[PDB]
Amino acid sequence: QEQMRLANQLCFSAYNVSRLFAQFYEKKLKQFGITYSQYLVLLTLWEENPQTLNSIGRHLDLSSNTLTPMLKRLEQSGWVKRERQQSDKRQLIITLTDNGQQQQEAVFEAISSCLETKYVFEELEQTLKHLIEK
Amino acid sequence: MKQEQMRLANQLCFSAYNVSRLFAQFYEKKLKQFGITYSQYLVLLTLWEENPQTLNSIGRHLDLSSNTLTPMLKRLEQSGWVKRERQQSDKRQLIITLTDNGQQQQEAVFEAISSCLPQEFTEYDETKYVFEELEQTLKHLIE
DNA sequence: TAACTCAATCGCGCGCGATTGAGT
DNA sequence: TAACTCAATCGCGCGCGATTGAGT
């Protein structure tokens, strides 16, 4: 009984924490007209450019069911180019635009100006991953 | 110093993102039998601790509003977990009350989830604290 | 042909910023 | 008349289980 009481408060906290993070980031990012999830995509691209959609998804644990509509939005607001690979026409190469690369510093400053754990999350992250399989 | 503190906030934000998605995935798997969602579960938890409540009250417990809870309490009524009825004293209000089935099925739902929790559960109390800390930190950061 | 691997698509339920309109 | 306080509604962007159809 008490092991359920723990899982619930812990689940519920994670639920509250992620919403709050999103709320916060979205407030700061409103200037740029990008969402929290779009920001997470742009982080991976700022760390490695270009990437395939599938590669981005692997970094974020997301798939085309989320990234397809959403990379289309980032293209439509000038952050990225979506183009097909010649080696493999099934693939989709995502490449940052100049504007997309350029605005990183501005975006990071917009958020930074308003600012054990990291381990504890990664622990639970890996615990849950296993629970979804075996 | 200028930048490395951002790299911390990002990995921490991204971890919380991943953790909550996984928690939802897990609970949704176990709750499929009962035909309820994670969020619906969270609403049922507050009702199992206090019944009846007004939609506004539930929302206060979960930091949600009618923009989420209206469509969703309608779903729980349709699957026989709750009654949605307006108050006489104040016709604006909406009283949510658990159905017998709704009350009754708590034990079964808890068991369905608890049976799949690893024995890894009197050395996770640290975690529960660390979350609540960040939860409160973030809540102040928004205001 | 076939098996495979991709992004794209579909349907649905949230979250939530914003607005509406009923009721006090 | 007004100031309030509610749930309901609207529009949009996710997440994601599932399917599709193009390409290898």
PDB file of all heavy atoms in Angstrom, chain D residues 4-17:
ATOM      1  P    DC D   4     -14.472  44.081  -9.407  1.00  0.00           P
ATOM      2  OP1  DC D   4     -13.509  44.617  -8.421  1.00  0.00           O
ATOM      3  OP2  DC D   4     -14.024  43.799 -10.799  1.00  0.00           O
ATOM      4  O5'  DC D   4     -15.108  42.830  -8.686  1.00  0.00           O
ATOM      5  C5'  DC D   4     -15.364  41.719  -9.491  1.00  0.00           C
ATOM      6  C4'  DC D   4     -16.178  40.720  -8.726  1.00  0.00           C
ATOM      7  O4'  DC D   4     -17.467  40.636  -9.377  1.00  0.00           O
ATOM      8  C3'  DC D   4     -15.498  39.377  -8.889  1.00  0.00           C
ATOM      9  O3'  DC D   4     -15.384  38.630  -7.685  1.00  0.00           O
ATOM     10  C2'  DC D   4     -16.277  38.704  -9.998  1.00  0.00           C
ATOM     11  C1'  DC D   4     -17.642  39.364  -9.957  1.00  0.00           C
ATOM     12  N1   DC D   4     -18.263  39.525 -11.285  1.00  0.00           N
ATOM     13  C2   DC D   4     -19.414  38.778 -11.572  1.00  0.00           C
ATOM     14  O2   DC D   4     -19.895  38.053 -10.689  1.00  0.00           O
ATOM     15  N3   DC D   4     -19.980  38.876 -12.794  1.00  0.00           N
ATOM     16  C4   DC D   4     -19.430  39.664 -13.721  1.00  0.00           C
ATOM     17  N4   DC D   4     -20.022  39.730 -14.916  1.00  0.00           N
ATOM     18  C5   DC D   4     -18.257  40.433 -13.458  1.00  0.00           C
ATOM     19  C6   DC D   4     -17.706  40.327 -12.243  1.00  0.00           C
ATOM     20  P    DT D   5     -14.288  37.504  -7.610  1.00  0.00           P
ATOM     21  OP1  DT D   5     -13.961  37.296  -6.168  1.00  0.00           O
ATOM     22  OP2  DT D   5     -13.218  37.846  -8.602  1.00  0.00           O
ATOM     23  O5'  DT D   5     -15.084  36.233  -8.136  1.00  0.00           O
ATOM     24  C5'  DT D   5     -16.272  35.830  -7.447  1.00  0.00           C
ATOM     25  C4'  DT D   5     -16.875  34.640  -8.146  1.00  0.00           C
ATOM     26  O4'  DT D   5     -17.534  35.070  -9.361  1.00  0.00           O
ATOM     27  C3'  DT D   5     -15.855  33.585  -8.569  1.00  0.00           C
ATOM     28  O3'  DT D   5     -16.414  32.308  -8.279  1.00  0.00           O
ATOM     29  C2'  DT D   5     -15.734  33.778 -10.068  1.00  0.00           C
ATOM     30  C1'  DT D   5     -17.134  34.228 -10.423  1.00  0.00           C
ATOM     31  N1   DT D   5     -17.295  34.978 -11.681  1.00  0.00           N
ATOM     32  C2   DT D   5     -18.392  34.689 -12.457  1.00  0.00           C
ATOM     33  O2   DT D   5     -19.214  33.839 -12.154  1.00  0.00           O
ATOM     34  N3   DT D   5     -18.493  35.432 -13.608  1.00  0.00           N
ATOM     35  C4   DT D   5     -17.624  36.412 -14.046  1.00  0.00           C
ATOM     36  O4   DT D   5     -17.844  36.999 -15.103  1.00  0.00           O
ATOM     37  C5   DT D   5     -16.498  36.669 -13.178  1.00  0.00           C
ATOM     38  C7   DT D   5     -15.497  37.701 -13.582  1.00  0.00           C
ATOM     39  C6   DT D   5     -16.392  35.951 -12.053  1.00  0.00           C
ATOM     40  P    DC D   6     -15.531  31.182  -7.614  1.00  0.00           P
ATOM     41  OP1  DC D   6     -15.887  31.120  -6.171  1.00  0.00           O
ATOM     42  OP2  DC D   6     -14.121  31.368  -8.063  1.00  0.00           O
ATOM     43  O5'  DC D   6     -16.053  29.884  -8.359  1.00  0.00           O
ATOM     44  C5'  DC D   6     -15.694  29.698  -9.726  1.00  0.00           C
ATOM     45  C4'  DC D   6     -16.907  29.318 -10.538  1.00  0.00           C
ATOM     46  O4'  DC D   6     -17.512  30.498 -11.113  1.00  0.00           O
ATOM     47  C3'  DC D   6     -16.562  28.423 -11.719  1.00  0.00           C
ATOM     48  O3'  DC D   6     -16.591  27.074 -11.256  1.00  0.00           O
ATOM     49  C2'  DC D   6     -17.619  28.782 -12.745  1.00  0.00           C
ATOM     50  C1'  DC D   6     -17.925  30.244 -12.450  1.00  0.00           C
ATOM     51  N1   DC D   6     -17.266  31.225 -13.321  1.00  0.00           N
ATOM     52  C2   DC D   6     -17.896  31.592 -14.514  1.00  0.00           C
ATOM     53  O2   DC D   6     -18.957  31.036 -14.827  1.00  0.00           O
ATOM     54  N3   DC D   6     -17.320  32.526 -15.308  1.00  0.00           N
ATOM     55  C4   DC D   6     -16.175  33.103 -14.935  1.00  0.00           C
ATOM     56  N4   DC D   6     -15.642  34.016 -15.748  1.00  0.00           N
ATOM     57  C5   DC D   6     -15.522  32.762 -13.714  1.00  0.00           C
ATOM     58  C6   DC D   6     -16.100  31.831 -12.942  1.00  0.00           C
ATOM     59  P    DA D   7     -15.764  25.950 -12.014  1.00  0.00           P
ATOM     60  OP1  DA D   7     -15.784  24.741 -11.150  1.00  0.00           O
ATOM     61  OP2  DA D   7     -14.474  26.540 -12.412  1.00  0.00           O
ATOM     62  O5'  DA D   7     -16.666  25.657 -13.295  1.00  0.00           O
ATOM     63  C5'  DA D   7     -18.004  25.158 -13.105  1.00  0.00           C
ATOM     64  C4'  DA D   7     -18.745  25.088 -14.416  1.00  0.00           C
ATOM     65  O4'  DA D   7     -18.617  26.359 -15.091  1.00  0.00           O
ATOM     66  C3'  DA D   7     -18.216  24.041 -15.389  1.00  0.00           C
ATOM     67  O3'  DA D   7     -19.306  23.472 -16.118  1.00  0.00           O
ATOM     68  C2'  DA D   7     -17.235  24.833 -16.238  1.00  0.00           C
ATOM     69  C1'  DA D   7     -17.875  26.211 -16.301  1.00  0.00           C
ATOM     70  N9   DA D   7     -16.941  27.338 -16.395  1.00  0.00           N
ATOM     71  C8   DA D   7     -15.860  27.604 -15.590  1.00  0.00           C
ATOM     72  N7   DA D   7     -15.232  28.712 -15.897  1.00  0.00           N
ATOM     73  C5   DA D   7     -15.943  29.209 -16.980  1.00  0.00           C
ATOM     74  C6   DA D   7     -15.777  30.358 -17.774  1.00  0.00           C
ATOM     75  N6   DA D   7     -14.807  31.256 -17.583  1.00  0.00           N
ATOM     76  N1   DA D   7     -16.662  30.564 -18.774  1.00  0.00           N
ATOM     77  C2   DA D   7     -17.646  29.673 -18.951  1.00  0.00           C
ATOM     78  N3   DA D   7     -17.909  28.559 -18.268  1.00  0.00           N
ATOM     79  C4   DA D   7     -17.003  28.377 -17.293  1.00  0.00           C
ATOM     80  P    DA D   8     -19.017  22.433 -17.308  1.00  0.00           P
ATOM     81  OP1  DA D   8     -20.208  21.559 -17.437  1.00  0.00           O
ATOM     82  OP2  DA D   8     -17.661  21.843 -17.114  1.00  0.00           O
ATOM     83  O5'  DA D   8     -18.946  23.357 -18.599  1.00  0.00           O
ATOM     84  C5'  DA D   8     -20.116  24.054 -19.050  1.00  0.00           C
ATOM     85  C4'  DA D   8     -19.792  24.877 -20.273  1.00  0.00           C
ATOM     86  O4'  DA D   8     -18.809  25.876 -19.929  1.00  0.00           O
ATOM     87  C3'  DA D   8     -19.208  24.081 -21.440  1.00  0.00           C
ATOM     88  O3'  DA D   8     -19.986  24.300 -22.616  1.00  0.00           O
ATOM     89  C2'  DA D   8     -17.795  24.617 -21.594  1.00  0.00           C
ATOM     90  C1'  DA D   8     -17.888  25.999 -20.992  1.00  0.00           C
ATOM     91  N9   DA D   8     -16.647  26.536 -20.437  1.00  0.00           N
ATOM     92  C8   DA D   8     -15.937  26.072 -19.359  1.00  0.00           C
ATOM     93  N7   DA D   8     -14.878  26.790 -19.076  1.00  0.00           N
ATOM     94  C5   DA D   8     -14.917  27.821 -20.002  1.00  0.00           C
ATOM     95  C6   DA D   8     -14.077  28.921 -20.224  1.00  0.00           C
ATOM     96  N6   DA D   8     -12.997  29.186 -19.492  1.00  0.00           N
ATOM     97  N1   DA D   8     -14.391  29.758 -21.236  1.00  0.00           N
ATOM     98  C2   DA D   8     -15.477  29.491 -21.975  1.00  0.00           C
ATOM     99  N3   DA D   8     -16.346  28.487 -21.863  1.00  0.00           N
ATOM    100  C4   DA D   8     -16.004  27.679 -20.846  1.00  0.00           C
ATOM    101  P    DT D   9     -19.694  23.444 -23.935  1.00  0.00           P
ATOM    102  OP1  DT D   9     -20.994  23.162 -24.588  1.00  0.00           O
ATOM    103  OP2  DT D   9     -18.787  22.318 -23.576  1.00  0.00           O
ATOM    104  O5'  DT D   9     -18.801  24.418 -24.821  1.00  0.00           O
ATOM    105  C5'  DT D   9     -19.187  25.779 -25.041  1.00  0.00           C
ATOM    106  C4'  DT D   9     -18.053  26.548 -25.675  1.00  0.00           C
ATOM    107  O4'  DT D   9     -17.053  26.861 -24.680  1.00  0.00           O
ATOM    108  C3'  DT D   9     -17.328  25.803 -26.797  1.00  0.00           C
ATOM    109  O3'  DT D   9     -17.606  26.477 -28.023  1.00  0.00           O
ATOM    110  C2'  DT D   9     -15.857  25.842 -26.400  1.00  0.00           C
ATOM    111  C1'  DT D   9     -15.795  26.911 -25.324  1.00  0.00           C
ATOM    112  N1   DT D   9     -14.758  26.742 -24.290  1.00  0.00           N
ATOM    113  C2   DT D   9     -13.790  27.713 -24.151  1.00  0.00           C
ATOM    114  O2   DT D   9     -13.709  28.685 -24.882  1.00  0.00           O
ATOM    115  N3   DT D   9     -12.902  27.493 -23.128  1.00  0.00           N
ATOM    116  C4   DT D   9     -12.886  26.428 -22.252  1.00  0.00           C
ATOM    117  O4   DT D   9     -12.028  26.370 -21.384  1.00  0.00           O
ATOM    118  C5   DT D   9     -13.939  25.457 -22.444  1.00  0.00           C
ATOM    119  C7   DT D   9     -14.000  24.263 -21.543  1.00  0.00           C
ATOM    120  C6   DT D   9     -14.814  25.662 -23.437  1.00  0.00           C
ATOM    121  P    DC D  10     -17.128  25.860 -29.422  1.00  0.00           P
ATOM    122  OP1  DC D  10     -18.119  26.253 -30.466  1.00  0.00           O
ATOM    123  OP2  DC D  10     -16.759  24.429 -29.227  1.00  0.00           O
ATOM    124  O5'  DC D  10     -15.769  26.630 -29.722  1.00  0.00           O
ATOM    125  C5'  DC D  10     -15.636  28.030 -29.435  1.00  0.00           C
ATOM    126  C4'  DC D  10     -14.229  28.478 -29.745  1.00  0.00           C
ATOM    127  O4'  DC D  10     -13.421  28.398 -28.547  1.00  0.00           O
ATOM    128  C3'  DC D  10     -13.518  27.635 -30.807  1.00  0.00           C
ATOM    129  O3'  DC D  10     -13.006  28.493 -31.829  1.00  0.00           O
ATOM    130  C2'  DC D  10     -12.430  26.901 -30.039  1.00  0.00           C
ATOM    131  C1'  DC D  10     -12.164  27.818 -28.860  1.00  0.00           C
ATOM    132  N1   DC D  10     -11.658  27.169 -27.640  1.00  0.00           N
ATOM    133  C2   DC D  10     -10.537  27.707 -27.001  1.00  0.00           C
ATOM    134  O2   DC D  10      -9.974  28.688 -27.507  1.00  0.00           O
ATOM    135  N3   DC D  10     -10.098  27.146 -25.850  1.00  0.00           N
ATOM    136  C4   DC D  10     -10.731  26.087 -25.343  1.00  0.00           C
ATOM    137  N4   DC D  10     -10.264  25.565 -24.208  1.00  0.00           N
ATOM    138  C5   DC D  10     -11.883  25.528 -25.965  1.00  0.00           C
ATOM    139  C6   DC D  10     -12.314  26.101 -27.096  1.00  0.00           C
ATOM    140  P    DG D  11     -12.455  27.881 -33.204  1.00  0.00           P
ATOM    141  OP1  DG D  11     -12.756  28.857 -34.284  1.00  0.00           O
ATOM    142  OP2  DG D  11     -12.923  26.468 -33.324  1.00  0.00           O
ATOM    143  O5'  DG D  11     -10.881  27.917 -32.978  1.00  0.00           O
ATOM    144  C5'  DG D  11     -10.275  29.051 -32.337  1.00  0.00           C
ATOM    145  C4'  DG D  11      -8.772  28.928 -32.385  1.00  0.00           C
ATOM    146  O4'  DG D  11      -8.313  28.372 -31.133  1.00  0.00           O
ATOM    147  C3'  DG D  11      -8.223  28.005 -33.469  1.00  0.00           C
ATOM    148  O3'  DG D  11      -6.964  28.520 -33.907  1.00  0.00           O
ATOM    149  C2'  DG D  11      -8.080  26.677 -32.752  1.00  0.00           C
ATOM    150  C1'  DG D  11      -7.722  27.097 -31.333  1.00  0.00           C
ATOM    151  N9   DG D  11      -8.207  26.211 -30.278  1.00  0.00           N
ATOM    152  C8   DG D  11      -9.319  25.406 -30.320  1.00  0.00           C
ATOM    153  N7   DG D  11      -9.496  24.718 -29.225  1.00  0.00           N
ATOM    154  C5   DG D  11      -8.444  25.100 -28.406  1.00  0.00           C
ATOM    155  C6   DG D  11      -8.111  24.690 -27.090  1.00  0.00           C
ATOM    156  O6   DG D  11      -8.703  23.886 -26.362  1.00  0.00           O
ATOM    157  N1   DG D  11      -6.960  25.324 -26.633  1.00  0.00           N
ATOM    158  C2   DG D  11      -6.221  26.231 -27.350  1.00  0.00           C
ATOM    159  N2   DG D  11      -5.141  26.731 -26.733  1.00  0.00           N
ATOM    160  N3   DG D  11      -6.519  26.621 -28.580  1.00  0.00           N
ATOM    161  C4   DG D  11      -7.638  26.020 -29.041  1.00  0.00           C
ATOM    162  P    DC D  12      -6.122  27.766 -35.036  1.00  0.00           P
ATOM    163  OP1  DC D  12      -5.560  28.792 -35.948  1.00  0.00           O
ATOM    164  OP2  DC D  12      -6.959  26.658 -35.576  1.00  0.00           O
ATOM    165  O5'  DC D  12      -4.925  27.150 -34.196  1.00  0.00           O
ATOM    166  C5'  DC D  12      -4.240  27.976 -33.247  1.00  0.00           C
ATOM    167  C4'  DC D  12      -3.258  27.136 -32.472  1.00  0.00           C
ATOM    168  O4'  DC D  12      -3.952  26.415 -31.422  1.00  0.00           O
ATOM    169  C3'  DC D  12      -2.538  26.076 -33.307  1.00  0.00           C
ATOM    170  O3'  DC D  12      -1.151  26.154 -32.979  1.00  0.00           O
ATOM    171  C2'  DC D  12      -3.168  24.773 -32.849  1.00  0.00           C
ATOM    172  C1'  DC D  12      -3.467  25.090 -31.396  1.00  0.00           C
ATOM    173  N1   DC D  12      -4.468  24.251 -30.706  1.00  0.00           N
ATOM    174  C2   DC D  12      -4.231  23.876 -29.379  1.00  0.00           C
ATOM    175  O2   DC D  12      -3.182  24.240 -28.830  1.00  0.00           O
ATOM    176  N3   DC D  12      -5.143  23.115 -28.735  1.00  0.00           N
ATOM    177  C4   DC D  12      -6.259  22.739 -29.360  1.00  0.00           C
ATOM    178  N4   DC D  12      -7.135  21.997 -28.682  1.00  0.00           N
ATOM    179  C5   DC D  12      -6.531  23.115 -30.707  1.00  0.00           C
ATOM    180  C6   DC D  12      -5.620  23.870 -31.335  1.00  0.00           C
ATOM    181  P    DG D  13      -0.057  25.563 -33.964  1.00  0.00           P
ATOM    182  OP1  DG D  13       0.808  26.673 -34.433  1.00  0.00           O
ATOM    183  OP2  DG D  13      -0.752  24.673 -34.936  1.00  0.00           O
ATOM    184  O5'  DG D  13       0.849  24.698 -32.987  1.00  0.00           O
ATOM    185  C5'  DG D  13       1.276  25.236 -31.726  1.00  0.00           C
ATOM    186  C4'  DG D  13       1.587  24.100 -30.784  1.00  0.00           C
ATOM    187  O4'  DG D  13       0.354  23.498 -30.316  1.00  0.00           O
ATOM    188  C3'  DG D  13       2.388  22.972 -31.436  1.00  0.00           C
ATOM    189  O3'  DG D  13       3.462  22.590 -30.579  1.00  0.00           O
ATOM    190  C2'  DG D  13       1.362  21.872 -31.633  1.00  0.00           C
ATOM    191  C1'  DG D  13       0.454  22.094 -30.441  1.00  0.00           C
ATOM    192  N9   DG D  13      -0.897  21.558 -30.571  1.00  0.00           N
ATOM    193  C8   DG D  13      -1.710  21.609 -31.677  1.00  0.00           C
ATOM    194  N7   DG D  13      -2.873  21.050 -31.483  1.00  0.00           N
ATOM    195  C5   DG D  13      -2.823  20.599 -30.174  1.00  0.00           C
ATOM    196  C6   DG D  13      -3.797  19.919 -29.400  1.00  0.00           C
ATOM    197  O6   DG D  13      -4.933  19.561 -29.732  1.00  0.00           O
ATOM    198  N1   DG D  13      -3.347  19.681 -28.107  1.00  0.00           N
ATOM    199  C2   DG D  13      -2.112  20.032 -27.625  1.00  0.00           C
ATOM    200  N2   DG D  13      -1.859  19.697 -26.353  1.00  0.00           N
ATOM    201  N3   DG D  13      -1.192  20.664 -28.336  1.00  0.00           N
ATOM    202  C4   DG D  13      -1.615  20.916 -29.592  1.00  0.00           C
ATOM    203  P    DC D  14       4.754  21.894 -31.195  1.00  0.00           P
ATOM    204  OP1  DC D  14       5.803  21.885 -30.140  1.00  0.00           O
ATOM    205  OP2  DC D  14       5.032  22.496 -32.526  1.00  0.00           O
ATOM    206  O5'  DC D  14       4.251  20.401 -31.425  1.00  0.00           O
ATOM    207  C5'  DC D  14       4.640  19.307 -30.576  1.00  0.00           C
ATOM    208  C4'  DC D  14       3.952  19.369 -29.236  1.00  0.00           C
ATOM    209  O4'  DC D  14       2.525  19.449 -29.452  1.00  0.00           O
ATOM    210  C3'  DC D  14       4.162  18.111 -28.400  1.00  0.00           C
ATOM    211  O3'  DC D  14       4.240  18.459 -27.021  1.00  0.00           O
ATOM    212  C2'  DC D  14       2.937  17.275 -28.732  1.00  0.00           C
ATOM    213  C1'  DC D  14       1.881  18.350 -28.820  1.00  0.00           C
ATOM    214  N1   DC D  14       0.668  18.033 -29.593  1.00  0.00           N
ATOM    215  C2   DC D  14      -0.419  17.455 -28.935  1.00  0.00           C
ATOM    216  O2   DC D  14      -0.313  17.176 -27.732  1.00  0.00           O
ATOM    217  N3   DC D  14      -1.556  17.211 -29.625  1.00  0.00           N
ATOM    218  C4   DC D  14      -1.636  17.542 -30.916  1.00  0.00           C
ATOM    219  N4   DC D  14      -2.771  17.271 -31.561  1.00  0.00           N
ATOM    220  C5   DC D  14      -0.548  18.144 -31.607  1.00  0.00           C
ATOM    221  C6   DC D  14       0.570  18.382 -30.911  1.00  0.00           C
ATOM    222  P    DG D  15       5.108  17.556 -26.044  1.00  0.00           P
ATOM    223  OP1  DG D  15       4.970  18.066 -24.659  1.00  0.00           O
ATOM    224  OP2  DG D  15       6.458  17.394 -26.651  1.00  0.00           O
ATOM    225  O5'  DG D  15       4.326  16.177 -26.093  1.00  0.00           O
ATOM    226  C5'  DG D  15       4.998  14.984 -26.478  1.00  0.00           C
ATOM    227  C4'  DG D  15       4.142  13.800 -26.106  1.00  0.00           C
ATOM    228  O4'  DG D  15       2.831  13.913 -26.708  1.00  0.00           O
ATOM    229  C3'  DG D  15       4.709  12.465 -26.575  1.00  0.00           C
ATOM    230  O3'  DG D  15       4.470  11.531 -25.523  1.00  0.00           O
ATOM    231  C2'  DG D  15       3.954  12.208 -27.865  1.00  0.00           C
ATOM    232  C1'  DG D  15       2.590  12.809 -27.567  1.00  0.00           C
ATOM    233  N9   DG D  15       1.862  13.307 -28.726  1.00  0.00           N
ATOM    234  C8   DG D  15       2.355  14.109 -29.726  1.00  0.00           C
ATOM    235  N7   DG D  15       1.456  14.431 -30.615  1.00  0.00           N
ATOM    236  C5   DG D  15       0.292  13.826 -30.163  1.00  0.00           C
ATOM    237  C6   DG D  15      -1.013  13.817 -30.719  1.00  0.00           C
ATOM    238  O6   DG D  15      -1.413  14.364 -31.755  1.00  0.00           O
ATOM    239  N1   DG D  15      -1.894  13.068 -29.946  1.00  0.00           N
ATOM    240  C2   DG D  15      -1.559  12.400 -28.795  1.00  0.00           C
ATOM    241  N2   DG D  15      -2.553  11.729 -28.193  1.00  0.00           N
ATOM    242  N3   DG D  15      -0.348  12.406 -28.261  1.00  0.00           N
ATOM    243  C4   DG D  15       0.526  13.120 -29.003  1.00  0.00           C
ATOM    244  P    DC D  16       5.208  10.141 -25.511  1.00  0.00           P
ATOM    245  OP1  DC D  16       5.220   9.658 -24.093  1.00  0.00           O
ATOM    246  OP2  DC D  16       6.456  10.274 -26.312  1.00  0.00           O
ATOM    247  O5'  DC D  16       4.207   9.236 -26.348  1.00  0.00           O
ATOM    248  C5'  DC D  16       2.869   9.027 -25.882  1.00  0.00           C
ATOM    249  C4'  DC D  16       2.117   8.191 -26.890  1.00  0.00           C
ATOM    250  O4'  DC D  16       1.441   9.058 -27.839  1.00  0.00           O
ATOM    251  C3'  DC D  16       3.003   7.267 -27.731  1.00  0.00           C
ATOM    252  O3'  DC D  16       2.292   6.053 -27.958  1.00  0.00           O
ATOM    253  C2'  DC D  16       3.126   8.020 -29.039  1.00  0.00           C
ATOM    254  C1'  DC D  16       1.714   8.560 -29.128  1.00  0.00           C
ATOM    255  N1   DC D  16       1.441   9.616 -30.118  1.00  0.00           N
ATOM    256  C2   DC D  16       0.134   9.744 -30.596  1.00  0.00           C
ATOM    257  O2   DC D  16      -0.754   9.021 -30.116  1.00  0.00           O
ATOM    258  N3   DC D  16      -0.132  10.667 -31.548  1.00  0.00           N
ATOM    259  C4   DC D  16       0.853  11.411 -32.052  1.00  0.00           C
ATOM    260  N4   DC D  16       0.542  12.302 -32.993  1.00  0.00           N
ATOM    261  C5   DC D  16       2.199  11.281 -31.602  1.00  0.00           C
ATOM    262  C6   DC D  16       2.449  10.369 -30.654  1.00  0.00           C
ATOM    263  P    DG D  17       2.880   4.661 -27.468  1.00  0.00           P
ATOM    264  OP1  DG D  17       2.929   4.666 -25.984  1.00  0.00           O
ATOM    265  OP2  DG D  17       4.120   4.408 -28.249  1.00  0.00           O
ATOM    266  O5'  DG D  17       1.715   3.649 -27.863  1.00  0.00           O
ATOM    267  C5'  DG D  17       0.387   3.823 -27.331  1.00  0.00           C
ATOM    268  C4'  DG D  17      -0.646   3.343 -28.323  1.00  0.00           C
ATOM    269  O4'  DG D  17      -0.894   4.386 -29.293  1.00  0.00           O
ATOM    270  C3'  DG D  17      -0.238   2.116 -29.136  1.00  0.00           C
ATOM    271  O3'  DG D  17      -1.408   1.335 -29.404  1.00  0.00           O
ATOM    272  C2'  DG D  17       0.347   2.721 -30.398  1.00  0.00           C
ATOM    273  C1'  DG D  17      -0.544   3.935 -30.599  1.00  0.00           C
ATOM    274  N9   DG D  17       0.090   5.043 -31.308  1.00  0.00           N
ATOM    275  C8   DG D  17       1.379   5.496 -31.151  1.00  0.00           C
ATOM    276  N7   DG D  17       1.660   6.515 -31.917  1.00  0.00           N
ATOM    277  C5   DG D  17       0.486   6.754 -32.618  1.00  0.00           C
ATOM    278  C6   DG D  17       0.184   7.730 -33.602  1.00  0.00           C
ATOM    279  O6   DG D  17       0.917   8.609 -34.067  1.00  0.00           O
ATOM    280  N1   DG D  17      -1.122   7.605 -34.061  1.00  0.00           N
ATOM    281  C2   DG D  17      -2.031   6.681 -33.615  1.00  0.00           C
ATOM    282  N2   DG D  17      -3.243   6.729 -34.179  1.00  0.00           N
ATOM    283  N3   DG D  17      -1.762   5.759 -32.705  1.00  0.00           N
ATOM    284  C4   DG D  17      -0.493   5.854 -32.251  1.00  0.00           C
TER     285       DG D  17
END
